[PDB]
Amino acid sequence: RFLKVKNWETDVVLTDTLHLKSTLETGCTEHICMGSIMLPTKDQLFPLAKEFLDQYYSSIKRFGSKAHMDRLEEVNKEIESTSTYQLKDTELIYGAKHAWRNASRCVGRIQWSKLQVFDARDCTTAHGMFNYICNHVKYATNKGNLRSAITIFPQRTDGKHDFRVWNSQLIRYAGYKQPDGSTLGDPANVQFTEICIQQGWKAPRGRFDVLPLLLQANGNDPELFQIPPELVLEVPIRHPKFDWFKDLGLKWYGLPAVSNMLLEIGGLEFSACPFSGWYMGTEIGVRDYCDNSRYNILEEVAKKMDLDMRKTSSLWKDQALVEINIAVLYSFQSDKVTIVDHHSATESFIKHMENEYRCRGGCPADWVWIVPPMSGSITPVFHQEMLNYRLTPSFEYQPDPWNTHVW
Amino acid sequence: RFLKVKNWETDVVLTDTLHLKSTLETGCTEHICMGSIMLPVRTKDQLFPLAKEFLDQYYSSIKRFGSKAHMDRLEEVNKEIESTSTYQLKDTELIYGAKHAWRNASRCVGRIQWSKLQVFDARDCTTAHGMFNYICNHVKYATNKGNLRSAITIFPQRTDGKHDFRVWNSQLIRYAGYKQPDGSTLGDPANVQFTEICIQQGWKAPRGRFDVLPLLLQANGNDPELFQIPPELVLEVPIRHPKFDWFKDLGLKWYGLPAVSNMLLEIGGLEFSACPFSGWYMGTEIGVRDYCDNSRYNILEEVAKKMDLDMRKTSSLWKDQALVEINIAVLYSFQSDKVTIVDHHSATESFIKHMENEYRCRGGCPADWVWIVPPMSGSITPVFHQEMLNYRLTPSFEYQPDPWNTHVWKG
Ligand code: HEM
Ligand code: HEM
Numbered sequence A: 001r002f003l004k005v006k007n008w009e010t011d012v013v014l015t016d017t018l019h020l021k022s023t024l025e026t027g028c029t030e031h032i033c034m035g036s037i038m039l040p041t042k043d044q045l046f047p048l049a050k051e052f053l054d055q056y057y058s059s060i061k062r063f064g065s066k067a068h069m070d071r072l073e074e075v076n077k078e079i080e081s082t083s084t085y086q087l088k089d090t091e092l093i094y095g096a097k098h099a100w101r102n103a104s105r106c107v108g109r110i111q112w113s114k115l116q117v118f119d120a121r122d123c124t125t126a127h128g129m130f131n132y133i134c135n136h137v138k139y140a141t142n143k144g145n146l147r148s149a150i151t152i153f154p155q156r157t158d159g160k161h162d163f164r165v166w167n168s169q170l171i172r173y174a175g176y177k178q179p180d181g182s183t184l185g186d187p188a189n190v191q192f193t194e195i196c197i198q199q200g201w202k203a204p205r206g207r208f209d210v211l212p213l214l215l216q217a218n219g220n221d222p223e224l225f226q227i228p229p230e231l232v233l234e235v236p237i238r239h240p241k242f243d244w245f246k247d248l249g250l251k252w253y254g255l256p257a258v259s260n261m262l263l264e265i266g267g268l269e270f271s272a273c274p275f276s277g278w279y280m281g282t283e284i285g286v287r288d289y290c291d292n293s294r295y296n297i298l299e300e301v302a303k304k305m306d307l308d309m310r311k312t313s314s315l316w317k318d319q320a321l322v323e324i325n326i327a328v329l330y331s332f333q334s335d336k337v338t339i340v341d342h343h344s345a346t347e348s349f350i351k352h353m354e355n356e357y358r359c360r361g362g363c364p365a366d367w368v369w370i371v372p373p374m375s376g377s378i379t380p381v382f383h384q385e386m387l388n389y390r391l392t393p394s395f396e397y398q399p400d401p402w403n404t405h406v407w
Numbered sequence B: 001r002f003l004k005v006k007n008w009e010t011d012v013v014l015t016d017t018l019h020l021k022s023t024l025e026t027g028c029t030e031h032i033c034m035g036s037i038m039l040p041v042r043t044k045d046q047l048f049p050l051a052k053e054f055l056d057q058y059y060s061s062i063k064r065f066g067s068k069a070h071m072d073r074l075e076e077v078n079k080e081i082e083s084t085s086t087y088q089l090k091d092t093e094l095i096y097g098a099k100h101a102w103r104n105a106s107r108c109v110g111r112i113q114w115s116k117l118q119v120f121d122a123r124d125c126t127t128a129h130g131m132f133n134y135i136c137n138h139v140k141y142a143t144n145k146g147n148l149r150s151a152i153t154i155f156p157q158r159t160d161g162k163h164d165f166r167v168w169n170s171q172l173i174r175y176a177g178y179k180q181p182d183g184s185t186l187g188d189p190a191n192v193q194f195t196e197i198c199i200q201q202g203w204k205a206p207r208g209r210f211d212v213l214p215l216l217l218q219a220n221g222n223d224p225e226l227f228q229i230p231p232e233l234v235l236e237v238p239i240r241h242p243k244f245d246w247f248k249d250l251g252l253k254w255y256g257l258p259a260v261s262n263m264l265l266e267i268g269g270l271e272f273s274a275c276p277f278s279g280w281y282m283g284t285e286i287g288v289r290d291y292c293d294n295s296r297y298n299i300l301e302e303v304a305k306k307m308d309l310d311m312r313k314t315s316s317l318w319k320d321q322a323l324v325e326i327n328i329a330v331l332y333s334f335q336s337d338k339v340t341i342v343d344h345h346s347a348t349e350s351f352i353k354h355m356e357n358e359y360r361c362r363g364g365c366p367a368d369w370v371w372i373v374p375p376m377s378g379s380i381t382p383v384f385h386q387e388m389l390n391y392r393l394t395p396s397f398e399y400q401p402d403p404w405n406t407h408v409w410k411g
């Protein structure tokens, strides 16, 4: 009931107390650790509301004041009456910033308090959703000078009227099974691409086709919309030394924007809440390009470098991985699109951890997601012990809507 | 109960029943995961249960469960415990035990090899000098002129915890670290504290960047004694690079034999506080950690300087670049000298095959993801994408505190 984390590179020891305020369940027991698993009424709602408003009023230094006891009473009466309640704009902004603050898998949280929140709770149609989302994309992109933002559609009511963005991210590339047997474009999105085509989409059947948004308002069947191309900022990938790199024909998008998550604030569930920041280089160059199940480009790059691909021990995979990531970084920087490298991002996260320990009593962190997918041990997060626990407000993963929705 | 693990690259789903045989604690709760925390005298009362579990397991493994030989051995151990407070393992049980501790070691990526382990029974040992002889024979057997063979040497078990055998070195072979008055370190920073104990015990330090440390050995709870491993027994590899001819002039070398000596082996309730074991290196242990940790030899800058990498900002990935070249060098050098080494691609691939086999035949394989994933190039190895269940099985290896913090000095 008082826990220590040690950094093994610097010997700095931090003391966590924030974990006692933790509420949801981790997946682990005394007997089994699930640290590496990807997915481990009225009466229910008032405690959840209360817990939230208590933290909110404490943050603005008005815990136990009349404005506190009055809001607690107002919310209580509204739940009693309507079976739900509405958040004040101030509460909504706070909840959103804190769900990011609490996101244990996010390395970029030094940035948590600079989050532009777009209140789309007044939305009612898929066309409305499209308008809001285009406005979010343009605001956040900001001609390459990226700004963090979230747009929050209306909360869950009876659960049969959910707003959902069916895309997993606002901007992604299509994937198509080929006669060949192989895959064209991004294999992650084969299924979704089919759902779009089975719902009307005219696919260009290219390697890098920006998918249509597929939007669900008020539990209705979802509809298709193309994001204005002038709003989707893309980056052709070149290398600062390798002439031939450009000829691979690689590009990626500047805006990472997760839109399949569920934002939970004071017991309320916001099932459509796309949010966006900016990239860490490795997300694109290590994962998007190199994962066997993704664009899987290592072989082709290794060939152009003329490495010895005969034996794994020549580290040809590793050598090519580094250059691919140098090129991702160099291209974003040259075209002036915000990107951070894993050295700088993990160094920032250590600074943020220390702020959160002295200021808040801790910082939940999932080491398995926080340490970059390349060069783990030469980044400082490798040597930092972390405690992982679930705080609310939070972002939660939710099932793909096609698996659920009735048509 | 059944727990499933998915591999997100292949969609292969495995079912773990083995976790049901797990007994000890993880450190985690339903409220906190301590998966990245590095560290998350027995009565009769406790002992016979631990013995019984163990012998039930051993007897099952030989398909003799419930045999007269099994029941007679249970009775015998019961009696030995009731009358003497402890018991002695048969050779066959010791061997099986040491094999299964390695098999159960969830942080070890090398476990495909668990059944081929040479066990040296050193339970007749009585003196530090005896321990020294035993360790020499182990080093020479394991080294085998570069054709490394896994081995373990097992000294007498704990009795009252006042009479422990301990190897004070954390590994049998390691380099001296020396703190300089100006605050720099010469040689290996990890070993500064232990080097200082050695010096105080009378070791004459050469004060070089790569001095092999003397063994400091404790028998029967006595004060530790110093011994120099014969140099002809310490196989070393000079580090050079296939294309970069200046690599050799950095003056690096490493020892071929990774040999962990500070861990405690538990078999059937008995505690073997000195049980050095050895295998062979995966290249990244040396090339990533030993050379490139900031708290170790820290050679990234010097390498990148020689390579003329752009070092003015991190986003040139100069560190990532230098790190790969060094790792290339370590594997090249070992291979050229015919010293057994495995790369992290081949090791993780073998591990996944081992792991799947273990689910089919054993009903699980406990694995610590934080340690199994290599410290470079994580996601281009198949373990990154592998969900893993971590739990504790016995027989087992455990961390124990360094003996210089606990030892009662006799004078
Ligand atoms: C501003 C720059 C940001 C950086 C550099 C960054 C970095 C990252 C990275 C590298 C990951 C792991 C992604 C992966 O490997 O798939 C991640 C995950 C995550 N981040 Fe951030 N992030 C940023 C902004 C944001 C914002 C604005 C939010 C929410 C407001 C957020 C919340 C999350 C969540 C919930 C996850 C886990 C996603 C999942 O479970 O699939 N992050 N972050
Ligand atoms: C045969 C070749 C072997 C290879 C390639 C191998 C590989 C490794 C590696 C890379 C680690 C992580 C160590 C680190 O990064 O510091 C490790 C840990 C470990 N291995 Fe192995 N291993 C081998 C043999 C053995 C043997 C023979 C045993 C005992 C019989 C053993 C038991 C352990 C234990 C207990 C750990 C955790 C050590 C700790 O917590 O400090 N391994 N293995």
Ligand SMILES: Cc1cc(N)nc(C[C@@H]2CNC[C@@H]2OCCCCCc2cccc(N)n2)c1
Residues within 6 Å of the ligand: A038, A039, A169, A256, A257, A258, A275, A276, A277, A278, A279, A280, A283, A397
């Ligand atoms: C099964 C599953 C669970 C879960 N919690 N998340 C996922 C999505 C997978 C996990 N890793 C890659 C993929 O998600 C991509 C998420 C987008 C990246 C997150 C992000 C958000 C904001 C900024 C930024 N730089 N990066 C999948």
Ligand SMILES: Cc1cc(N)nc(C[C@@H]2CNC[C@@H]2OCCCCCc2cccc(N)n2)c1
Residues within 6 Å of the ligand: B038, B039, B110, B258, B259, B260, B277, B278, B279, B280, B281, B282, B285, B399
């Ligand atoms: C605090 C602590 C706990 C714990 N369980 N282990 C340690 C020792 C740390 C862990 N990683 C670096 C350092 O020890 C070196 C590990 C020894 C190598 C393991 C090994 C054995 C046999 C063969 C091989 N290739 N590798 C430290």
Ligand SMILES: C[C@H](O)[C@H](O)[C@H]1CNc2nc(N)[nH]c(=O)c2N1
Residues within 6 Å of the ligand: A035, A036, A037, A038, A368, A369, A370, B008, B384, B385, B386, B387, B388
């Ligand atoms: C099985 C394992 O949990 C899975 O591969 C995780 C590992 N760490 C990760 N880390 C990040 N940042 N993103 C991921 O998608 C994953 N995948």
Ligand SMILES: C[C@H](O)[C@H](O)[C@H]1CNc2nc(N)[nH]c(=O)c2N1
Residues within 6 Å of the ligand: A008, A382, A383, A384, A385, A386, B035, B036, B037, B038, B370, B371, B372
């Ligand atoms: C804090 C963290 O658990 C610690 O630095 C671990 C991470 N993973 C590791 N993995 C291996 N193989 N060896 C190690 O020493 C470590 N150190």
Ligand SMILES: [Zn+2]
Residues within 6 Å of the ligand: A028, A032, A033, A034, A035, B028, B032, B033, B034, B035
């Ligand atoms: Zn856990």
